[PDB]
Design an enzyme around this catalytic site. Sequence first.
Site, mmCIF file in Angstrom:
data_model
loop_
_atom_site.group_PDB
_atom_site.id
_atom_site.type_symbol
_atom_site.label_atom_id
_atom_site.label_comp_id
_atom_site.label_asym_id
_atom_site.label_seq_id
_atom_site.Cartn_x
_atom_site.Cartn_y
_atom_site.Cartn_z
ATOM 1 N N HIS A 1 0.741 -1.261 0.000
ATOM 2 C CA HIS A 1 0.000 0.000 0.000
ATOM 3 C C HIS A 1 0.773 1.316 0.000
ATOM 4 C CE1 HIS A 1 -3.504 -2.561 0.978
ATOM 5 N NE2 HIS A 1 -4.179 -1.583 0.403
ATOM 6 N N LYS B 1 -9.238 13.847 3.792
ATOM 7 C CA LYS B 1 -8.396 12.657 3.855
ATOM 8 C C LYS B 1 -7.545 12.827 5.122
ATOM 9 C CE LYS B 1 -5.828 13.338 0.150
ATOM 10 N NZ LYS B 1 -6.773 12.984 -0.937
ATOM 11 N N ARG B 2 -6.844 11.784 5.546
ATOM 12 C CA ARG B 2 -6.023 11.896 6.752
ATOM 13 C C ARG B 2 -4.976 13.004 6.602
ATOM 14 N NH1 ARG B 2 -6.184 7.810 10.635
ATOM 15 N NH2 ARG B 2 -4.595 9.128 11.658
ATOM 16 N N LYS C 1 0.450 14.351 1.726
ATOM 17 C CA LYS C 1 -0.826 14.674 1.086
ATOM 18 C C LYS C 1 -0.888 16.182 0.815
ATOM 19 C CE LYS C 1 -3.299 10.729 3.166
ATOM 20 N NZ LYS C 1 -3.985 10.185 1.951
ATOM 21 N N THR D 1 -8.218 6.669 -3.019
ATOM 22 C CA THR D 1 -9.536 6.133 -3.361
ATOM 23 C C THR D 1 -10.550 7.261 -3.248
ATOM 24 O OG1 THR D 1 -9.748 5.321 -1.079
ATOM 25 C CG2 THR D 1 -9.131 3.736 -2.772
ATOM 26 N N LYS E 1 -14.062 8.535 -5.513
ATOM 27 C CA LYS E 1 -15.367 8.871 -4.967
ATOM 28 C C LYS E 1 -15.872 10.207 -5.521
ATOM 29 C CE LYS E 1 -13.888 6.583 -0.774
ATOM 30 N NZ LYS E 1 -13.510 6.988 0.569
HETATM 31 C C1 PLP Z 1 -12.224 6.927 0.940
HETATM 32 C C2 PLP Z 1 -11.830 7.466 2.333
HETATM 33 C C3 PLP Z 1 -10.488 7.671 2.675
HETATM 34 C C4 PLP Z 1 -9.317 7.613 1.638
HETATM 35 O O1 PLP Z 1 -9.179 8.914 1.047
HETATM 36 P P1 PLP Z 1 -7.856 9.281 0.172
HETATM 37 O O2 PLP Z 1 -8.058 10.689 -0.247
HETATM 38 O O3 PLP Z 1 -7.565 8.247 -0.847
HETATM 39 O O4 PLP Z 1 -6.714 9.238 1.277
HETATM 40 C C5 PLP Z 1 -10.176 8.044 3.942
HETATM 41 N N1 PLP Z 1 -11.140 8.222 4.877
HETATM 42 C C6 PLP Z 1 -12.444 8.019 4.587
HETATM 43 C C7 PLP Z 1 -13.455 8.124 5.728
HETATM 44 C C8 PLP Z 1 -12.812 7.654 3.308
HETATM 45 O O5 PLP Z 1 -14.148 7.482 2.997
#
Ligand code: PLP
Lengths: 809, 809
Positions: B350, B541-542, B547, B649, B653
């Site tokens: 990952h 995102k985190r 990032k 991911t 979305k």
């Molecule tokens: C999909 C999702 C992530 C991953 O987001 P990225 O921008 O790819 O890091 C993290 N947290 C939640 C709650 C998500 O739904």
Amino acid sequence: QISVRGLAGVENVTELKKNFNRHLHFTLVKDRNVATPRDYYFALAHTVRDHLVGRWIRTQQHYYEKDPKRIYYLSLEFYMGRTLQNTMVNLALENACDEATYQLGLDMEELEEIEEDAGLGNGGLGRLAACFLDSMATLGLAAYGYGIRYEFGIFNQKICGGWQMEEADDWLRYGNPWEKARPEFTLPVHFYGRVEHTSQGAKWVDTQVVLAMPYDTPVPGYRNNVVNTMRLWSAKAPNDLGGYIQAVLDRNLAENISRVLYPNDNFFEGKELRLKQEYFVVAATLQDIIRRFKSSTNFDAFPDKVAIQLNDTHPSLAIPELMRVLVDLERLDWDKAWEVTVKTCAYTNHTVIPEALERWPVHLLETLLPRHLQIIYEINQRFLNRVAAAFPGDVDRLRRMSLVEEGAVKRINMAHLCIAGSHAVNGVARIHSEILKKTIFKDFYELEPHKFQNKTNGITPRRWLVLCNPGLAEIIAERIGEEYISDLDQLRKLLSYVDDEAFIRDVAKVKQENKLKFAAYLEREYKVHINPNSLFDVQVKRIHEYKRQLLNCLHVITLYNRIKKEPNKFVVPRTVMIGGKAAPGYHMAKMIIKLITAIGDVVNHDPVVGDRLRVIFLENYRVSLAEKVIPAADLSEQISTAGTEASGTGNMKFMLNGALTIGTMDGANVEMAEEAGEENFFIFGMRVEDVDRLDQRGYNAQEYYDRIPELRQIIEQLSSGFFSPKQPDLFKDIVNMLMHHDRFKVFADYEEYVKCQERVSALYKNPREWTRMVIRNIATSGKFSSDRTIAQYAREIWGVEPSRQRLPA
Amino acid sequence: QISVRGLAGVENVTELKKNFNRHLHFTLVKDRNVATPRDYYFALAHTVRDHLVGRWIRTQQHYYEKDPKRIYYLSLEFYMGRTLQNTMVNLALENACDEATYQLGLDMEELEEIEEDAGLGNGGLGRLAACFLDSMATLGLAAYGYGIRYEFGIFNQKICGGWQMEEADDWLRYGNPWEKARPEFTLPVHFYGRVEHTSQGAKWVDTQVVLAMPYDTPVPGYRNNVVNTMRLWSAKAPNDLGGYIQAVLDRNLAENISRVLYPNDNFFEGKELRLKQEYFVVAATLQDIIRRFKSSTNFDAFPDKVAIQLNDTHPSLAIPELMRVLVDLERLDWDKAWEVTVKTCAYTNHTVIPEALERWPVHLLETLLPRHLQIIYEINQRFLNRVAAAFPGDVDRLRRMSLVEEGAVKRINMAHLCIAGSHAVNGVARIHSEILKKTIFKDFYELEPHKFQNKTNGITPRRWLVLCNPGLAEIIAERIGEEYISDLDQLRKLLSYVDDEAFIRDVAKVKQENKLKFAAYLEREYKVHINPNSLFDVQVKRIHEYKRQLLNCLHVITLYNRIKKEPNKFVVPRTVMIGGKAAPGYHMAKMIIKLITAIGDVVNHDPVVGDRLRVIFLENYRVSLAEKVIPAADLSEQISTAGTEASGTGNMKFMLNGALTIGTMDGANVEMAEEAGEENFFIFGMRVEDVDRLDQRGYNAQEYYDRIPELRQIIEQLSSGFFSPKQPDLFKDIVNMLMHHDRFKVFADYEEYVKCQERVSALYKNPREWTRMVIRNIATSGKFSSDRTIAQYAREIWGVEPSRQRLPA
Ligand SMILES: *Cc1c(COP(=O)(O)O)cnc(C)c1O
Ligand SMILES: OC[C@H]1O[C@H](O[C@H]2[C@H](O)[C@@H](O)[C@@H](O[C@H]3[C@H](O)[C@@H](O)[C@@H](O[C@H]4[C@H](O)[C@@H](O)[C@@H](O[C@H]5[C@H](O)[C@@H](O)[C@@H](O)O[C@@H]5CO)O[C@@H]4CO)O[C@@H]3CO)O[C@@H]2CO)[C@H](O)[C@@H](O)[C@@H]1O
Ligand SMILES: OC[C@H]1O[C@H](O[C@H]2[C@H](O)[C@@H](O)[C@@H](O[C@H]3[C@H](O)[C@@H](O)[C@@H](O[C@H]4[C@H](O)[C@@H](O)[C@@H](O[C@H]5[C@H](O)[C@@H](O)[C@@H](O)O[C@@H]5CO)O[C@@H]4CO)O[C@@H]3CO)O[C@@H]2CO)[C@H](O)[C@@H](O)[C@@H]1O
Ligand SMILES: *Cc1c(COP(=O)(O)O)cnc(C)c1O
């Protein structure tokens, strides 16, 4: 099958089977091809539970409407045992469910054995709480049992090498279908902190907070459609923080409060965790009580709507806690608050044994409950001022009555606190209540004679007769009907069948079947080997020096030595069964258990003895085991030293189930003998007065050792290593204790005990007469029903009238 | 109401209402007059749950009959989120339940908000596991998700004074209706101990035992009547023991294993408790797998019936554990066991970030898992022997490929262990998988090129389209039907409506409604104040340095400074929303959050700015919050430094929900741009090759500071205390890091980022064209469905064929 188990209607059995399959499928998520007996037990449990909910909701709704005076029974122990069969009995579903399960190809009493005991108690005190909840529901009282939901109850006892081994009792492992978690009613409890005095009054601040989450369990009355509530609190940490991880892991510290039941029976241990448990249940319960009260602002009517019964001193903090709330939060003046508190609270004393008295070190209360200590000191001052005004110049009286004990370490006498803050104080048997007035609480009785009462203990005839001895309940119903089940006094009508040849035959037949069934279980589980024709001599209760299992041991050894003396002489064969748990840190109690198994090792393998004498130690004695062994007993051993057993309740269970009693004039034994007639009881030993006279001149065990050859022989065998070849001095502590530091005068009652035991062997060899005496005991045991006990509490202490009125189904 | 939510039959709605009232009464033990919204949520939950059980039992029965190859997905994280609505969608009960609840006078989406998120994950990795379970069930695979049942998932984030505060996530507080405890299948797990070598082989003895109790949760496929299982293990202590009390209280030590989820996203922390969690899930899962296998003795067919997928290296111990069982217990020879192990295991990588790589100290494994260390050393030796035989004399290669890293402290490289014991290793996006072969695992790729594959991540269209954006799912269904929901590629048909005036209007209308609904929620909860007409700029995102939320921050500040520069100039208004959690011990991440709120404090209250610019920090970002904000976004920020985000991911979305994307050529962004056409994407910044060239000559942030006036101004404001008046040097760490130790070259991409951002503002002021570009993105997002991803895993790694065949209802 039998009448007293209700009828199995076509429509009923069909509806039960349907719901059984529904739960197995939807609730347990299983199919007939992967289900195990446990799954079947649960399907049945949820099925029966369903029939309770309708009544449960209506009952609570009823109380909200009529708004009757509420009774709150506070106890740190509720020794409930199994719930499945008791629920069926009180709902009259036993035969219907038995039929329904039969048609599904399942044995119902096989499923009942799968249920874990709710062992949230140590013994007498906790079982009494359980019998009481049952009676209060059967008498239509708006009562609530309040306690703690321990995730680990009394430990499971295992015997290894004859020694007791303790094992955690993980009773919630497979889940508890009877409880309903109520997270929405969670309440905060405070600990530690400090007290600030403002112009507005005192304030308890900077405290640590622990949440109390309640779990409600239904308590069904006997076929009256009444279902009361038992609310048990569970400790939970607030979500609001070494590290992030450690902070989350340290939540366990706060939740340890409700983790395990202290396993001490009639013994005080001043540990901080125990004090926290005591305050935890009290603080959460009172907020719940006040909340419910405000939903019916002057508390002048509080005692007209609320009664708080303290089961021993364990929940004694309810007194200063109630004051704290009324004074600090509601802001009533001291005198008004105190008046309300005394009118609301009542205290029940359970023992006069000094080591059982709760005396908390002031430094503990000072750190853990700052404000409560101040309130207690304040209560004490005003109380001592009244003593001084009534007994001017009696300075020693002041020191004896103080709630504060002076010395190297100051302590708070919780019993003195309870008497001061309660409008009623009761003992649990006539002789015990008198002793309270003559000795231990003499000074308090002199100041407020009106507070002292007696409320002789009782047991519930539902669980202790109908449920555990259906066969006996049936043959009784055949003659006088079923009304007796909720009115035990009617058993007196059986006195007219004492000469009835048919009845005599049936009573003896039921006893015989019960013995055969227990003899089988004893061999099916635990691979043992008893003779169903011998007399069943049983003593089951917690292991204690005052209960004197040791005196029983001396008799057994005497019997053995007499057989080896004259092998070819005839003697009434016996199966001596002793069972009970010893508190983990009670050395002497652990040695007594090892001694019992050691005697069994010698006696049970001596070919000369044959099957004329067997010594069995009943492992893991608990409520469910009591339901099996008591109905099968011939002789009940209640041999505590006169003046030590406050009441006892096991004694009553045996009377109601057809066993004759050999015991001392102690506790309820006195009233039992009085009810059945001394001629129908095997009484022996010193009376309370004799013990006193002996303490006067001083008890010298040596004297009995020198004057009784047989006694001397037994001690020598013990010392020499006759019962412990590989460890000759294994029992030196026991001999030393009996010879030099016996607080319970075992030797003093030996002679009369052995003689009396011969008297029972003589009556046993005449079946007809033994059974007739048995009938006289059963027929007069009506007074020991907990329904009578509760009715007296209701009328003489709580001020409420019991009701047998059926509630709408 | 809308077509895609199924039909509300008369018979169906009537049956639902009936069961709703049944559960409220019998299950929750409540009446309409005391029930709260929470009680209503639970009644509905149990009602829906009922419809799953029939299918659940039949599905598992089906697998037992046909006995297909089993797929086991091992992960320490399953970021499930809420389960109620997702279950209704997959069972086509949404409209029926909505109607039924309506008729009972209840608002269904009000009840849905009461459900607690199952937050058993940190972010991407855990959510991927969740999307995968859904796809595997939708594709008829006999798959099982295996993990840990943490009683505390990812912490709830609160902002105090602009700072992040962590709060325990007590998600099991009110109970979990979706899980079924299975105490009957409890398994023992061993820790510590030592290894004895006999003539029969090695033996692991004197170990500490911890029990693993499973809890099963149903995973319904999309309208195919398939219900798979997710089995989560909970730690429990054996009943068999300082004192009796302490021994009972110390049971918590063993049960702490499953107490809380480590909150680190892409960061390795070598704590012992974490290692225990890793072995705990692996050891329990493998015994379960073998047991199920033996119920279908040579393991030669093991890999034909079993596939074990390792989600990252977290469950890497499965490799030596499988060997331990096969060699030590089953007694197969090493070579045979190894062959089976490699054919059974597959590993998914990952990240290439060094600080995220698991490297366990040998002294830890040595104490905790004695036998596993020996097995790992043995695996390493045989592996290095093969390397030496293929690359004779290449001694440095041997040292680089060893599973054992030498140095002051020996460590085990778990990624090297995974590659060696797996028949397949895959990256999660094309560019990431190439990078694995070119750099990090170049040596391994050279030895076994056949093991390396790519499996671009995907998201489930059920939860990420139908469930969270019904409005968009509906207008799409109107044009091309509902088939696309389980076959996203069909969305390409929408390319023919790019010039359809009606469609363009509807797409823009749905987006507008979603923004209005989120704008309301933002004000209803959290009392905020956004303008629904502005462009919704969102980065959720985190919080991580790679990032680059910081680059986003610089843009926001640039925008603000330009407005104050020329106040009366027109600018496309924006609402910049940044949200995400920072690991508790990640200082820099905590500072970034404080900086975001600090910018908001200045910008959101500057009258000159008005409602032209707003900076909102979205609190407690989690799955349920993602379902609300993503459908309302106009612009998706995916700006990680090229080469650092393995895949991402969240980006997918946003594409599926109508937002345009501004991002770097990193992770899946490359494939997304490739699918939609670069002209329909806002790409900027350095490519991987540019980052490399820059590291070559050395990155000097100073250079950008001296050549870019606007950038210089922003740093000076930060240093001087413009955004922190009371604490002028509050952000000295941030400035220092950006100027001297920026591992992610924030400044290097600033210029192109700002310019590109101007390009998006320009397209936004032309509604028609912005929407048309949006349609081109949605229409080409079909490839990012997790159904496609799973189908590739099934065929290229597990060797099983996916099936859309409806299972009998
Ligand atoms: C999909 C999702 C992530 C991953 O987001 P990225 O921008 O790819 O890091 C993290 N947290 C939640 C709650 C998500 O739904
Ligand atoms: O706010 C009203 C009140 O406040 C203040 O008084 C408080 C005290 O400051 C506080 O210490 C506490 O007093 C306790 C006392 O600490 C505790 O030891 C106990 O004292 C009793 C003994 O228990 C009792 O035996 C008896 O003592 C005898 C003793 O036996 C005998 O051998 C010989 O030594 O004489 C002794 C005294 O005659 O009596 C004492 C005194 O009652 O109980 C006390 C009261 O609970 O609480 C006080 C009130 O809260 C102020 O100082 C005071 O002026 C205010 O009126
Ligand atoms: O039962 C079969 C086997 O058992 C015994 O061997 C075992 C060892 O006793 C045991 O220590 C373990 O060996 C490990 C070793 O401890 C560990 O450090 C590692 O060693 C690797 C290095 O990781 C690798 O880098 C490379 O080292 C280079 C080094 O980089 C270079 O700078 C320079 O110093 O030269 C070094 C050696 O050339 O190679 C070593 C050696 O492989 O991995 C080892 C294997 O996992 O496990 C052994 C087997 O279980 C007996 O002693 C042996 O005779 C038997 O055949
Ligand atoms: C009734 C009972 C007791 C009390 O017995 P006594 O002989 O009065 O001490 C203790 N334990 C159990 C399980 C009981 O049923």
